[PDB]
Structures are given as structure tokens and as C-alpha cells.
RNA sequence: GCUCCACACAGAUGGAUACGAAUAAGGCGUCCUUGUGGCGUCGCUGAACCAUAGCAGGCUAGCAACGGUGCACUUGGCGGAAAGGCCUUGGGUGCUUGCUGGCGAAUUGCAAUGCGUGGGGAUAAAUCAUUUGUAUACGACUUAGA
RNA sequence: AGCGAAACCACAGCCAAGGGAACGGGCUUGGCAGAAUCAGCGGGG
RNA sequence: GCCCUGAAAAUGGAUGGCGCUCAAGCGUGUUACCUAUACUCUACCGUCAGGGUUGAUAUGAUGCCCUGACGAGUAGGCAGG
RNA sequence: GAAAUUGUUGAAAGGGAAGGGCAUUUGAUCAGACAUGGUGUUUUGUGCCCUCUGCUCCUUGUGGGUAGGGGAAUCUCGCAU
């Protein structure tokens, strides 16, 4: 399952974006820019907003050499 | 705590080693009064000594049933030495100013001596049994 | 898989069954065998009845009592059979036949709970159709086991009290298989099918 | 201030902060059945005729509570 | 030092046959000599005997866990020979050197940069 | 809600052996549902953990672990070869070993 | 055991998911002429079934159902093979992902699972010692005694 | 109740079968095996 | 060809055991797999052989290297500790 | 003041044998830095620094030891802040 990603500006973040030398108020501003520019595209497809919020697990009889992802 | 215990050694004792090992171990960890009384009872053939290691050809008696053994005997000379000791230890403690009523043979121990003779050292050690306690809210 | 695999002899081949029941404990697999008496074997009867007594004679000399004890009761018959392919004697062994349990009949708490079988070991499915094949029950008896009946009788009971059960269930389902049927064909459903379900 | 040489506690210092009469000690013993309450414990001191003594007496009187 | 990873080859002690059964026969290795002996004929299951293959990698030989070669220093002159090999040798102060003398060998080695393999020897705080 | 399982539950069968001489470095693992060498190839080189409680608490948890890799297959049944850091104990022959899904090829 | 003090703390990780008998036969559904009866249909693997979304599963707003389910209670019934469980009635209280919401998750920094003691007190009994002999190498056994 | 040796001592001591060589006592495959101890035979080595 | 018979006793008894019968037996064929101190490859030890190395080498030329092969062993021989 | 050997205590193991080798687990236990910088700049303050004046030991310039003053507004030459 692929989404639309082309609406997103991502080029701000590289390696150096992740140094540390209580959460930085700069970092949370980039969250919401990405997220709101993303939510839109997830809302198109049915159940995807719900699909993402859930946790993947293995269930009895899921043999993962058989399984398709 | 050494401020709580009184010891009493006896050495180069012309007693059968093997019998002593027994009467000692028999009495190991007893309240001094119940202990001393018991050695009177072995003397009167009321109770017998549970021989355990050095015990081949000891004639089975019911008195053994008190402990968990079938074999048991009444040995005079051994015990004669051991209550001789206990009596001493008691008196040591009274010089040290203790409570004799709480007393107990914490550690007794017997090992051979030089030699044919077969002599043996004994060291028993008696202690106050510490209790007495309270709290608040 | 399942923590306890209550098996069920009823048409298996003492051997084979065993073997596998075996491996499975060795590989840490709590089993439990039932209806031992309805275990089977290979060959006529008047055989197993030998390939046994012989076994019987065995026993010890100077002191008969100390020796190869000849158990009668099925269960055990079959036990042996098995405690015979498991290095019994060694932690890992004992540690097994530790994991085992072989009742004749099918007493609680197992009555109430699904069992199963072990292909790779049913008369029907291994013995060239129509060939001599013995059936413990007799074979026990024939040589001591004093109960064949108790089991038997105090059986029929079970079967009953169950089937009865059944019903009540068969009745139940039906209803479902009916509800689902009707409330089946409405969208939602449909969809599923597409995916498959 | 407590110190360790080897894996055992040994030295123990008591400095009074301005001015500063300052001691240092060698613990020998240490061990571990009481399980004490949160009530504040009573002091007792024994044998101190010497003036150097009732300076160490004069230490602990201070360094432990005068609440009890 | 960026030393090579030191391979130990054989970490168990080479005990002597039967040094376990009898209290007279000692843990100090000695070859077996009877021609009916199994050890000498290296039957399976029986104790491993020292052969030349267990020999250590010549690059890593003598090297302790620190990746330094042990070296015994008696006095403060003998230490100052390693003035040049701090990266390679470790000043083991020798066992008989006193308390009063040691504290002086530790002064220098700390200053020179020699890693002493055995400090806290006799010394307290 | 019921499952948090992100691993396949296999059992620890043996050390690779002979009739006579076992090498304890190569632990043999059965994995759940795997039947062939083909199905096993998938699991090759995923990390295994053997997990167990011990008596004493160590890092705020009584619950210790060993780690290791599926390395190659073994016969046809899908029994697989596996090497741990410290070898697995033998006393654990026929115990559960949690086989994981990193590293993915998928 | 009850009571008072003092201390001490062979491998779970969604579900063992209940007919019996036969296998040159069987389920399951339906009509009854109630049968070794007819018509329909299934099987060729559990690859199923049932559960399964929420901080390892939070805090709050409604809609639609009148159900699902958890928990101590309560009514009645069943289970003796190793019953030591399995159902049901009534109410209370949670939860509901059946439907739609509104908030929180970060920094854990790119992997390293995340119920006994040692003394007391009260009271049940056994043993020793005594007595008897149906017993006896010694034990053990049998008796009797507030 | 006391006193109190010596000879002796590689080590242990359950059966059944197999272990080629008038070799079975440790091995192989089984049967099995619960601590502790006293009294018999005249039983075998 | 397979099968029964084609005699052998005497302490209980052994395809090694359990057990096996459209085999887990016999005959044959095909593939898959299991594992030795065997073979291949890499590192390491040591030994032997061949060599390099001085108007001197960022370590004792009785040094410091380069290449290759080899490694059971009693009496016995030689050598280093 | 060794070893055999003996007692006591604590831990552990023990269904007709124990000790040994390969490998790990658990239990108890032992280690586990008087490590604390490095570099590049910037205030100052000092000296073996600059500079004024010297004194002395010896062998060849490519020398060694050590006084008296002054000065940082040049100087990182060293060393402390």
C-alpha cells in the first residue's frame, strides 16, 4: 500500500537535522507541516486512517513465509 | 556477639573420641536447662543418645524413636565429661553476668587429641537467646 | 499450536501411534492418549496373544517379584510400547514420560474437550484393506485386565450424555448457518467475498 | 565525606562548614535484623573524661538529632 | 593501542593425567610414557595434551588483555627505560618492593604515562 | 489487543550431532508450520532469541535472554541450524525459541 | 491448626475450537410412507473456525441498537471415571471498534524480550515411661490407666 | 556400662543378553532402582 | 521368487531395544538429506626448503623480512628450553 | 606450621557407583580507571622572554653554567589564570 507523497516537502531534513550535542519547539513545528500535508492523502482511501492507527501482529496460523505484505 | 556468649574448653581428655562426637551432637542447640536435664535422663536410662555415625552393633530401642533413629545407647563416661563441661560453662556465664534461663549451646565441637591412647578435645560455647522487642505508630 | 493435544487411540496401531506420540514429548509436547483399549495392532489375534505371553514368561529367576513386570491394563501395554523409544532413564527421558498420560476410556476432564487423531497411524489408512488386525480390548483381557466392562459400560454412558450434547449443538448451529445465510447477501458480506471470507 | 580504597568503606570525614573543626575516622567493622521505625532515635555516649574526647563527644552530639 | 584481537587458542589449563584422582600426583603437566596408556595414544574423550599447534600468534604473544607486554620494574631507574614504550609495555611493579618504595614508582609511572599492571599493591588511603 | 507477537514460535530440538558426538555450537530449531527447506530459506539469517526467567533480578527484570542467528537449513523437514552467542544450554532441549522478523529481506 | 510478637518474598504470551460408528462408507439439510425410506447437498485437509483496530491499549462528545461482552452477587439445574466443573435466572456495575467524533503519544534519539521462619499463648493428638500378653532375637505388635 | 586391637585395603560391588581369543567387574542394548538399619542361612565367589 | 516344513532342549532373552505388516521386511530404481581428525578454502603455530636485506636498516645481520611445502609414532637419534 | 587425616559450621548433590573431557545454564562469588583531557583562539600576570651590564668552565661553533637592572604599549618565547 502506497500513498501520495509528492505533496510533501521533505528536503528540509537530512542527517544534521538529527543532532543533540524538554522536546524542541522547532521539531514539533515541522511535524504539523508534514502531517497536515499528509492526512489529506490518507483521507482519500477508505479505512487507511484506521489502518495506520492499529498495530501489526502475527496471529495463530500466520506463517510469514506464506504471508504477503 | 562475644559479649553474649560464654565458652568452656576441655582438652586431652581420656574419653572415647567416638562416643563424645555423639553426646555432643545429641545436645547441640538446646536450651541449657532442657539440655542439662536430658543428661540426667541418659544417666537414669530414661532417654538414650542417638548414635548416628559410629554406631555399628548398637541395640535398637524405642528411645531412639524420639529422634528419628532406631539405634541409640546410654553412655555414662562420655556424658560425665559433657555435663561436667556444661556445668562449667554455666558458671563462666554467671561470672560474665548473663541470663542463664535463656541460655543455649550455640556451638559445641569435638576433635581428636595427640596419642595406644585415643584422647579428645572438646569446646562447647553457650549463648543468650535474644528476643524482647516492640514498636510504635 | 495447542498446549495439550489429547489424542485418541480408537483405530491406531500401537506402534506408529507410539513412535509419534514419542518424538512429540521429546520435542516438548504435552500429549494425552485416550480410549487406550480401542487401540489396535497388526496381525491375527492369536498372535499379539503370543508376541506377548512370551514377553510374559520373561520375569526374573531367583526373585520373580523384582523383574520384568507384566502389566495388563491396555493403557500401560501401550505405555511400555513407548517408554521404549525415549532414552528413559535420563533426565531428558524421565522428563518425558513425565509429559505423557494414557487413560483407558476417556474420563474427565478430557471427555469435555476436543480430541484428534494421527493420520500417519490408523488401521483404516495403512493396513492393506482387509487384513488380520488385533484390537487390544480382547488382547488385554485375554491376559488379565479385569474391567474391559467397567470401561465399556461406564462408557456407553459417556457416549450418551454426549451425543445428547451434540444435538443441542447441532440444533444451535443450524440456527446460525441460517441467520448468516439470510443476513448473508447484503453488501458488507458481498465485499468480503471479493477478498474471500 | 565517605571514602573507599578497595571495595570496602573505610574513611569518614566530618567538617563543620564555616571556620571548621574537622575530624577523620577509620571504620573497621560493618555488617548485616531490626528494621527500624521512622521515629527519631535517642543518643547515648560512654567514657569521655579526656578533653580531646569530649570534642568527639562534642561532634556527635551535633551531627545526630537532638529531637528524640 | 589499536591492537589485533587476541586469540587465545586454548584457555583451559593443561592438567596432568590422573592429577585429579591422586593427591600425590600433581596438576603440573607431565607427559605419559607407558605404551599401554590411552592418553599417550590420544583416544577420544581423554584429556587434551599440549602440542605445538596451540602456540600463540607471534604478533599477539605475551600481550595481556590491556594489549601491553608485561615488564617487571624493581626501582625507579628500571621503569624509566620504558620512557619510549608506554604504548607497548606495562610496568608490573615487582612483588617484594615495599610500601614506602612503591608509592614512589607510582608517582613516576603516572607522570611518564606508563600503565602499571598492579597498582593498589600494599597501598591504602 | 490479544497479540503483541512479532515472531515465529519455534522449538529448540538439539545440538547438531552424530550418533555419538554432538557439537553444541549448532543448535537445531524447528519453526512453526515450516515444512520444507524452501519455506525455511525465508527465515535464514533472522535473529533468534531464547527467553527465560531466572531466580535473581539483574537490570530491574528477572527475565533474561540469549540471542542468535538461523544460519542454514537441516534435512527436509525444515528443522533449521542456528548459532547463538553463548550456546544454548541443552537442559533446554525442547524449549521455545522466539524467531524474529528482522533483518527483513522483505 | 488458631492466636500474639520479630523478621523474611523441562519452559504462559489469541483460543485444548467436546457426537458416536463405519471407512467396499459416511456426515449435513428436507419430505414423511417412520424406514437398512426418498429427494437435496458436502468432503478431495485446521490453508478452517471463532476471536482479532484503541498509552502493553489512555482521557472525553454523541448517534443507532435492546444486542455482544467483562465483573463480583443471586435463582435453579447438571457432572462420581480422576465428579472439583459446566450451564442457566434476576438485578447492579464497567466496556463496546456497530456508526461518527474530539484529545494524548515524540527525547526510549537507527537494532539489544521490557507466600516461609523463631519464639511465646490457648488446644487437638501421638510418642516415651508404666501396665497386659493373643505378640516377641531386638524392635515391632496387642492391651490398660486423670 | 568401661577399656580396646590386627589382618586387610587401586576403585566400586543388582540382574539378562552381546561383548570373537578356556577375560568379564567398569563397555553396548535392555529389565530396573528411593533415604536409613538389625537378625538368619552356612547360599554363591 | 517369496512363504510354511526342511528337528533342539533344558536359570528369563533378544533383527541392539521398542516395535513393524499397500512395512519401519524382500527386490529394484530415482532423487533429497545426515556426518569423520577425509577433502577444499582462510587464519594461526612450528619445522623444513628457497631466497632478500650494507657507502647499513625508523629493534640484538646469532637481527628484520619474502615465498612455498609439510606436521601419527615405540626402541632409538638429534636439537631448543 | 604443608599434606594426608579429624571435628564443627555453611553451601551443594545423592532411585544399585563417584571422579574426567567438550559446551553452556543457574546459584554464590571476584574483578571492573586518585582516567578527566586534546586542539585552536582571547584577557592579563610572570620567567630561563625582550633588552641593558656581566662573570666563569672549557674545545670550535651549531657551545655550557650563572648575576645586577629595567620592560611589556607586541608577543605566545615558555608557564600559570
In short:
The structure is cut from a larger assembly and holds chains A (69 residues), B (137 residues), C (197 residues), D (68 residues), E (125 residues) and F (106 residues). Chain A is mainly α and 69 residues long.
Which structural traits does this protein have?
part of a larger assembly; 6 chains; D: 68 residues; alpha+beta; three-stranded antiparallel beta sheet; 1 helix; 3 strands; 16% helix; 22% strand; F: 106 residues; mainly beta; Thrombin, subunit H; globular; RNA-binding
Architecture blueprint of SSEs:
This is part of a larger assembly, with chains A (69 residues), B (137 residues), C (197 residues), D (68 residues), E (125 residues) and F (106 residues).
Chain A (H helix, E strand, L loop, with lengths): L24 H20 L3 H6 L16
Chain C lengths: L13 H13 L18 H4 L4 H5 L16 H8 L55 H5 L6 H9 L7 H19 L6 H7 L2
Chain E lengths: L68 E5 L2 H4 L9 E5 L5 H14 L13
Chain C binds 4 RNA strands through helix 1, helix 6 and helix 7.
Structure, described:
This is part of a larger assembly, with chains A (69 residues), B (137 residues), C (197 residues), D (68 residues), E (125 residues) and F (106 residues). Chain B contains three helices and four strands; from the N terminus they run βαααβββ. Chain B has helices at residues 17-27, 32-43, 76-95; strands at residues 5-13, 103-107, 110-112, 120-128. Chain B is globular, with a radius of gyration of 16 Å. Chain D is α+β, with helices and mostly antiparallel strands and 68 residues long. Helices cover 16% and strands 22% of the residues of chain D. In chain D, strands 1-2-3 form a three-stranded antiparallel sheet, with no helix packed on it. In chain D, a hairpin with a 4-residue loop joins strand 1 and strand 2. Chain D starts with a strand and ends in a 5-residue tail after the last helix. In chain E, strands 1-2 form a two-stranded parallel ribbon. Chain E contains two helices and two strands, in the order βαβα. Chain E has one domain. In chain E, 14% of the residues lie in helices and 8% in strands. By secondary structure, chain E is largely without helices or strands. The chains are: A mainly alpha (69), B alpha+beta (137), C mainly alpha (197), D alpha+beta (68), E little secondary structure (125), F mainly beta (106). At the D-E interface, loops of D face loops of E. The structure holds four RNA strands. Chain A: It is found in: Cytoplasm. Chain A: Its main location: cytoplasm. Chain A: One of its GO terms (molecular function) is RNA binding. Chain A: Belongs to the eukaryotic ribosomal protein eL6 family.
Amino acid at each position: 500500500t502506497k500513498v501520495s507523497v509528492e505533496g510533501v516537502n521533505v528536503e528540509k531534513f537530512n542527517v544534521e537535522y538529527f543532532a543533540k550535542e524538554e522536546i524542541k519547539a522547532e521539531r514539533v513545528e515541522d511535524q504539523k507541516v508534514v502531517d497536515k500535508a499528509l492526512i489529506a492523502e490518507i483521507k482519500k482511501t477508505p479505512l487507511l486512517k484506521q489502518y495506520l492507527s492499529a498495530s501489526f501482529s502475527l496471529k495463530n496460523g500466520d506463517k510469514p513465509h506464506m504471508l504477503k505484505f | 556477639n562475644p559479649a553474649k556468649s560464654a565458652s568452656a574448653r576441655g582438652s586431652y581428655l581420656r574419653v572415647s573420641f567416638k562416643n563424645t562426637r555423639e553426646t555432643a551432637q545429641a545436645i547441640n542447640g538446646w536450651e541449657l536447662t532442657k539440655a542439662q536435664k536430658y543428661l540426667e535422663q541418659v544417666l537414669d536410662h530414661q532417654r538414650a543418645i542417638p548414635f548416628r555415625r559410629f554406631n555399628s552393633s548398637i541395640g535398637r530401642t524405642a528411645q531412639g524413636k524420639e529422634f528419628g533413629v532406631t539405634k541409640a545407647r546410654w553412655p555414662a563416661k562420655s556424658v560425665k565429661f559433657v555435663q561436667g563441661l556444661l556445668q562449667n560453662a554455666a558458671a563462666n556465664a554467671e561470672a560474665k553476668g548473663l541470663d542463664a534461663t535463656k541460655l543455649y549451646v550455640s556451638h559445641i565441637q569435638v576433635n581428636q587429641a595427640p596419642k595406644e591412647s585415643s584422647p579428645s578435645h572438646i569446646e562447647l560455647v553457650v549463648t543468650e537467646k535474644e528476643e524482647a522487642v516492640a514498636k510504635a505508630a | 499450536v495447542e498446549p495439550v493435544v489429547v489424542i485418541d487411540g480408537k483405530g491406531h496401531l500401537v506402534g506408529r501411534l507410539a513412535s509419534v506420540v514419542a518424538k512429540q514429548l521429546l520435542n516438548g509436547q504435552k500429549i494425552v492418549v485416550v480410549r487406550a483399549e480401542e487401540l489396535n495392532i497388526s496381525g491375527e489375534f492369536f498372535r499379539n496373544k503370543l508376541k506377548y505371553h512370551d514377553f510374559l514368561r520373561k520375569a526374573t529367576a531367583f526373585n520373580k517379584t523384582r523383574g520384568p513386570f507384566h502389566f495388563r491394563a491396555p493403557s500401560r501395554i501401550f505405555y511400555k510400547a513407548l517408554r521404549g523409544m525415549v532414552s528413559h532413564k535420563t533426565a531428558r527421558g524421565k522428563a518425558a514420560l513425565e509429559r505423557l498420560k494414557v487413560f483407558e476410556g476417556i474420563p474427565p476432564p478430557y471427555d469435555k474437550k476436543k480430541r484428534v487423531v494421527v493420520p500417519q497411524a490408523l488401521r483404516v489408512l495403512r493396513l492393506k484393506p482387509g487384513r488380520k488386525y488385533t484390537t487390544l480390548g480382547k488382547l488385554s483381557t485375554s491376559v488379565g485386565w479385569k474391567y474391559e466392562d467397567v470401561v465399556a459400560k461406564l462408557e456407553a454412558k459417556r457416549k450418551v450424555s454426549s451425543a445428547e450434547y451434540y444435538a443441542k449443538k447441532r440444533a444451535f448451529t443450524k440456527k446460525v448457518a441460517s441467520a448468516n445465510a439470510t443476513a448473508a447477501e447484503s453488501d458488507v458480506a458481498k465485499q468480503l467475498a471479493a477478498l474471500g471470507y | 565525606i565517605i571514602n573507599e580504597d578497595k571495595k570496602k568503606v573505610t574513611g569518614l570525614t566530618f567538617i563543620h562548614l564555616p571556620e571548621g573543626p574537622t575530624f577523620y575516622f577509620k571504620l573497621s567493622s560493618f555488617v548485616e535484623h531490626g528494621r527500624p521505625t521512622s521515629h527519631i532515635p535517642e543518643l547515648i555516649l560512654n567514657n569521655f573524661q579526656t578533653r580531646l574526647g569530649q570534642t568527639v563527644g562534642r561532634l556527635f552530639q551535633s551531627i545526630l538529632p537532638q529531637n528524640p | 593501542l589499536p591492537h589485533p584481537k587476541i586469540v587465545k587458542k586454548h584457555t583451559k589449563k593443561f592438567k596432568r593425567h590422573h592429577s585429579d584422582r591422586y593427591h600425590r600426583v600433581a596438576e603440573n603437566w607431565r607427559k605419559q610414557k607407558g605404551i599401554d596408556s590411552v592418553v599417550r595414544r590420544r583416544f577420544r574423550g581423554n584429556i587434551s595434551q599440549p602440542k605445538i599447534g596451540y602456540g600463540s600468534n607471534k604478533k599477539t604473544k605475551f600481550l595481556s588483555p590491556s594489549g601491553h607486554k608485561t615488564f617487571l620494574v624493581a626501582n625507579v631507574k628500571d621503569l624509566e627505560t620504558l620512557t619510549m614504550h608506554t604504548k607497548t609495555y606495562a610496568a608490573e611493579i615487582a612483588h617484594n618492593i615495599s610500601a614506602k618504595n612503591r608509592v614512589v614508582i607510582l608517582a613516576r609511572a603516572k607522570a611518564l604515562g606508563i600503565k602499571v599492571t598492579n597498582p593498589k599493591g600494599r597501598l591504602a588511603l | 489487543a490479544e497479540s503483541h507477537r512479532l515472531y515465529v514460535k519455534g522449538k529448540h530440538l538439539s545440538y547438531q550431532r552424530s550418533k555419538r558426538v554432538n557439537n553444541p555450537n549448532v543448535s537445531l530449531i524447528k519453526i512453526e508450520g515450516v515444512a520444507t527447506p524452501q519455506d525455511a530459506q525465508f527465515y535464514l539469517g533472522k535473529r533468534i532469541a531464547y527467553v527465560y526467567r531466572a531466580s535473581k533480578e539483574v537490570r530491574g527484570s528477572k527475565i533474561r535472554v540469549m540471542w542468535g542467528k538461523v544460519t542454514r537449513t537441516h534435512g527436509n523437514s525444515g528443522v533449521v541450524r542456528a548459532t547463538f552467542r553463548n550456546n544454548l544450554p541443552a537442559k533446554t532441549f525442547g524449549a521455545s525459541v522466539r524467531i524474529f522478523l528482522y533483518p527483513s529481506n522483505i
